Ligand binder design. Sequence first.
Ligand SMILES: Cc1cc2nc3c(=O)[nH]c(=O)nc-3n(C[C@H](O)[C@H](O)[C@H](O)COP(=O)(O)O)c2cc1C
Ligand SMILES: Cc1cc(Nc2ccc3cc4ccccc4cc3c2)n2ncnc2n1
Ligand SMILES: O=C(O)c1cc(=O)[nH]c(=O)[nH]1
Length: 378
Amino acid sequence: ESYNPEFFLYDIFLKFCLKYIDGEICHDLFLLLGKYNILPYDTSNDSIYACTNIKHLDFINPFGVAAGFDKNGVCIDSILKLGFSFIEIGTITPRGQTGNAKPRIFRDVESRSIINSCGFNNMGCDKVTENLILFRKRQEEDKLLSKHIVGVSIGKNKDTVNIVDDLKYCINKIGRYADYIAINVSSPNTPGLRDNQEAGKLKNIILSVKEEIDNLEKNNIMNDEFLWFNTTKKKPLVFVKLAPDLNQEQKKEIADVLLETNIDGMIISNTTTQINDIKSFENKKGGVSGAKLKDISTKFICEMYNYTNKQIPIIASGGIFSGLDALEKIEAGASVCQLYSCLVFNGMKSAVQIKRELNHLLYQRGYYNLKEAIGRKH
Ligand SMILES: Cc1cc2nc3c(=O)[nH]c(=O)nc-3n(C[C@H](O)[C@H](O)[C@H](O)COP(=O)(O)O)c2cc1C
Ligand SMILES: Cc1cc(Nc2ccc3cc4ccccc4cc3c2)n2ncnc2n1
Ligand SMILES: O=C(O)c1cc(=O)[nH]c(=O)[nH]1
């Protein structure tokens, strides 16, 4: 669709909610509108020149929704139908968690930034799996959901003993319904602050996850069409989400581990705790998203692309609002882009607008297709 009065109507309403209403209340209200399917669709064809892929995972367009937006997979269809090629649901944990004390999400309109200390609030693996299953069933009968990718972000409980025990439990429950799994070792907001990113630990963590996935394939007697009730009809790829608050050595050490473990991709990056010059946020705890994160994460993409010798596919996040923002991420080495803050500040038109902007920009820079632009800034 577009341009629409439908889009425009909701973007007035959203700007109103932004001025007057609590962020988390607004988010939940819009998730609820999405669940009842009264939000706009982008029914347009995506440019065959902005297709992209990660290994054998194929994206109709280079834009997805980041993790934390739909933690419980209650709104997947409606978010996808806004014009995104994929969504990363979660982060989920083996059991439900309330998360930290409310209010825990604050916005700063002028810097177009967000700070949050949610602390992995989610309904837990079992309920979210049931939600994802219902989505997969709907997807079989919904033409606008065909070839759309759902990844699942997985983490640990707040009091949990061993992180790995948690990841394995999630994999066994939800893995069959996922096109990829994102390992969340990077959230500030669960104590660590980082769920362990230390290279030896990570290596163990990556290996354990691949194995669980492998195990699902071995244990089951059904053919793949049947086992993988997902989009790809294959086993989920394994990504890891990294925090930008690391030093060059830590980054070098992580880069080696990713190569050693043969990880399918890295999501660069999560929220930062290194931002200070946001006045409204000075009394606040958590990680910062949005425009202030942009250059930090772009620089981080560049480094990890270099350190991994261009061998590991990158998913970019965040501070991405414009087609230019997207191209910067792509030329630094990202194959695909995730949006979060952009939806908060720019509303229903985020995917429609950013796709148009990037298409026009890819054209006016001589690139024949998107894949030509990946890593070209180096
Ligand atoms: C309120 C909120 C909740 C989030 N929850 C998660 C989460 O559950 N898991 C995760 O990996 N990232 C989470 N994130 C981080 C985002 O996925 C994203 O990486 C970050 O916002 C940077 O993108 P952006 O600048 O476009 O917002 C959350 C971010 C915010 C704003
Ligand atoms: C005003 C505001 C909004 C918001 N969240 C949004 C914004 C856009 C959304 C679009 C959707 C589109 C389809 C389905 C669900 C959707 C859910 C949405 C949720 N937040 N979050 C933290 N502060 C916020 N302030
Ligand atoms: O749940 C959260 O608090 C959270 C998780 C995460 O990975 N990143 C973030 O900024 N917040």
